[PDB]
Design a protein around this ligand. Structure first.
Ligand SMILES: Nc1ncnc2c1ncn2[C@@H]1OC[C@@H](O)[C@H]1O
Ligand SMILES: Nc1ncnc2c1ncn2[C@@H]1OC[C@@H](O)[C@H]1O
Ligand SMILES: Nc1ncnc2c1ncn2[C@@H]1OC[C@@H](O)[C@H]1O
Ligand SMILES: Nc1ncnc2c1ncn2[C@@H]1OC[C@@H](O)[C@H]1O
Ligand SMILES: Nc1ncnc2c1ncn2[C@@H]1OC[C@@H](O)[C@H]1O
Ligand SMILES: Nc1ncnc2c1ncn2[C@@H]1OC[C@@H](O)[C@H]1O
Ligand SMILES: Nc1ncnc2c1ncn2[C@@H]1OC[C@@H](O)[C@H]1O
Ligand SMILES: Nc1ncnc2c1ncn2[C@@H]1OC[C@@H](O)[C@H]1O
Lengths: 258, 258, 258, 258
């Protein structure tokens, strides 16, 4: 099977990458960074995010694996000490696949679409920032404040969490909208995070300023002459390789509790 | 078809009930409050909650309808002026059914099970209140504070909202756990609301005190010699009659925005 | 000087109490638990709270000292290992006094007044709980929800913190009001904690139910036939003995950060 | 007395400015926009903020007045219909002065100091944003997130409120620090807003990136090669003219409740 390995690029991560490549050489595995079937990321959740976006055009063809060389990650999630064990299992094909939902972002000026694994955010570009929030064609609120964040389920433990959003098991096909410092006095928003199912479309439309900072995961991205930003749960999913039981709620506990 | 009508019991609600009964008399509808197929509640969301619990042993056989004689409700949701129109549609059978998820609560001392339409909460009974929170058999956190709230999707606009939880579209089969004033210093909890899918079981277990106040919707309910409280999304659903499009997000907007 | 020592009553605390009494016997110090000039509390913040309320009728005459036999406390704040050192300093009189503000609570049915070192809270007694909040004679809000908390500055790190209140340096003569799960839809409150200076009077008045649970620190206290609860910063202060610099913000860091 | 009048610059505000100038012409009042003793601002709180910063070099010599031509403001606070009445009172000298605390911001690369009437904020410039928070020379926390906000008491109803801070009566000489989306997992902050008294110094120091967006009220202000940002309650105060009783808590009620 074709595989590739990305590294965060520190000594630890690079050496482990080389050891894994060497270990893969003892089996019928070929290093292909153009059309891999298996993408191994070595570092942290940030490195994994790069790996996802490196290979988002071939998501249906790829199984992802994350190895943390620092503290536990939500995507990266395997210990370096177990890397020798994963070489064998991967080469022997002794693994299932689990899929997490993704977020589709559409930006209309022409249209550009993006996939987020964690979230997409909209901000300005100079203070607030006024947008009309439209849900399935019906105007829901006029938001004034710092920005808005639309998160996938696995992204709920990242930015969404810091903004007060709910943590959502990634088996739920949904997206979550959170507010960043909304003004409430004109001027009224819901306050609460909102959780939308598949096929719901949330649209953001400008009121005065048309120039926004739009993020997708770690990428951002000042958008000029924007007419609309559209969110919905993607038809596409990211596939992980597993291996062993490491439940989402254990990862939450291990990351935030103890 | 067998139907019944509950009233909040003010002049407005009682008179409208009598008018509807009279209106139902012009069709082939019989008033049966023992085995109704249609349960109409006239008043507010509180009245609807009573109606649900009045008839929870026959949920699979019943379609519910809410009429608000005061301000808009989430369950009660039809205007009094449209009551004549619903008599006809109901009697002619020109309506579909929509189903919302429910919350199953199990209390072990023997076991007692309950269904919540909004939420179930656990409190003490004397300050805090220490419970071990166990998710699918694995200890997640030791909670110390005022209490905990487990909410259905349609319940997310009630108590759950006041506690900082996310608002969840009721097409999502999930439950949401929120904290009430948790101590964080011993003593660590997640803080964030947690959203669980079907088949996840959240268990609360006592640390010292075994005497809790346990609520299910408007009912509560000091429980003595408790060993465990178990939560999961129920296999059972409440069925509403509809009629016309009145989207959840419109009801949210209409209730909280304008 | 007359002194007394309260103990949390575990082996650790009792043995240290006896050792301190023995150590005080080597100086001109007499054990008087009726009219002490120095009150030493050995245990935690909870034990200190008992000590304060044991001796609140003689606050102007007493200097308090807290020794933690477990983890660091905000009032209790000295290590057991430094107990021998405090015996000498106390007996030699090598110490200044620092004063923290207190909260006066007045309950009118006749009137009863109380002093809080941490906070006073009002709850029901059966769900919510509706009160009119009146600030300096002008109606401010109708609160509906779980309850309200009025905190002193040193109390801001306790219940007030769990409810989302600001942490306030205890050199500021102020009180802070926080909400517990307020309904916002009728029904509107400020949401934000409110910080009042000396001479501001906040009054809570019943709307329907007149039977409340009223807490003062660890004491509570179901109040029957209540007409009004009044809050203001007390003219009275608690005096601590010091000794050495242990800044409030260090105690905050040491308790909540690392 | 020398006076000047700033206008938000819409038809309403300009016409009222001209009418007031004409009205002032009937008394011994001279229009001086260089060295006024009275600064009248006509528009909203935003216009008032401009007026304050226009004249911050002569704060000890000036009494400010705000007139709202739209909805009620916290600084602007008089109705247009009462403008004729204020002309007379001002010209007759039938008014007291009330003072609110200000925030001093010091930025060290050389030093630059600023006065804020509402708040000063620090952000990046590219995501987070890591700063060491030092309180009175002792390291308090390493903050990672979107930014930080330091607010005066009258500023607590603005940005500070949207970030979850407490509302503080402006008779209290204090400043309030709030967090914007802090990461908590490395990586720990207090969470709670912090309220500091006069003479406390809060310092922000860079960890990696030295290029910040620094705001003072409506001004911002990308700062290059920054070593430190220092906050403390200013020795200087803004003086308002009054006139009549319009209590802070009434303004809060009138702005946010009803
Ligand atoms: N899905 C996720 N859940 C929690 N933390 C995440 C995350 N993705 C990235 N991060 C963390 O965000 C800041 C970086 O330190 C990275 O580890
Ligand atoms: N203030 C903040 N708090 C938490 N996470 C943040 C954050 N800013 C960016 N991220 C995370 O860093 C990787 C992105 O996907 C986003 O989730
Ligand atoms: N699902 C729900 N969503 C929002 N509000 C609800 C609700 N159920 C009951 N209430 C309201 O809770 C307090 C009562 O006034 C009732 O209207
Ligand atoms: N403090 C509070 N805030 C909001 N809703 C509350 C509440 N206490 C009870 N309820 C709602 O009243 C009907 C119950 O189902 C619950 O949702
Ligand atoms: N002023 C205060 N600040 C922080 N924690 C406090 C406190 N008073 C009591 N406690 C803690 O509240 C629960 C107990 O564990 C006690 O230590
Ligand atoms: N839910 C809660 N969270 C934090 N502190 C609490 C609490 N309930 C009581 N206390 C504290 O315990 C001692 C009291 O003074 C109060 O501050
Ligand atoms: N001190 C304050 N309190 C409340 N709102 C304020 C304020 N200063 C400016 N604004 C409002 O912030 C956004 C603008 O609309 C302005 O009215
Ligand atoms: N997201 C936000 N929410 C509330 N107020 C804000 C805000 N951004 C800027 N301001 C206010 O606009 C005038 C500034 O002083 C600040 O208080």
């Amino acid at each position: 099977m074709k595989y590739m390995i990305t590294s965060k690029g520190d000594e630890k991560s690079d050496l482990l990458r080389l050891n894994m490549i060497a270990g893969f050489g003892e089996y019928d595995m070929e290093y292909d960074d153009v059309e891999p079937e298996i993408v191994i990321s070595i570092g942290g959740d940030g490195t994994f995010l790069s790996a996802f976006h490196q290979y988002e055009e071939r998501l249906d063809e790829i199984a992802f694996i994350g190895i943390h060389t620092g503290h536990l990650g939500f995507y990266a999630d395997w210990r370096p000490a177990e890397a020798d064990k994963l070489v064998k299992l991967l080469a022997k094909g002794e693994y299932q696949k689990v899929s997490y939902p993704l977020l589709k972002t559409t930006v209309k000026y022409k249209e550009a679409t993006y996939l987020a694994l964690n979230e997409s955010t909209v901000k300005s570009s100079g203070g607030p920032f006024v947008v009309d929030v439209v849900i399935n064609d019906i105007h829901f609120e006029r938001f004034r404040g710092d920005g808005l964040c639309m998160s996938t389920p696995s992204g709920t433990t990242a930015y969404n969490k810091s903004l007060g959003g709910a943590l959502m098991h990634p088996s739920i096909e949904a997206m979550q909208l959170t507010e960043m410092a909304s003004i409430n006095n004109v001027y009224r928003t819901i306050g609460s995070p909102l959780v939308f199912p598949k096929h719901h479309v949330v649209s953001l439309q400008p009121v005065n300023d048309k120039d926004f900072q739009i993020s997708v995961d770690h990428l951002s991205i000042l958008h000029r002459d924007v007419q609309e930003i559209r969110y919905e749960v993607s038809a596409k999913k990211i596939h992980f390789a597993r291996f062993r039981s490491f439940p989402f709620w254990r990862r939450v506990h291990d990351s935030f509790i103890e």
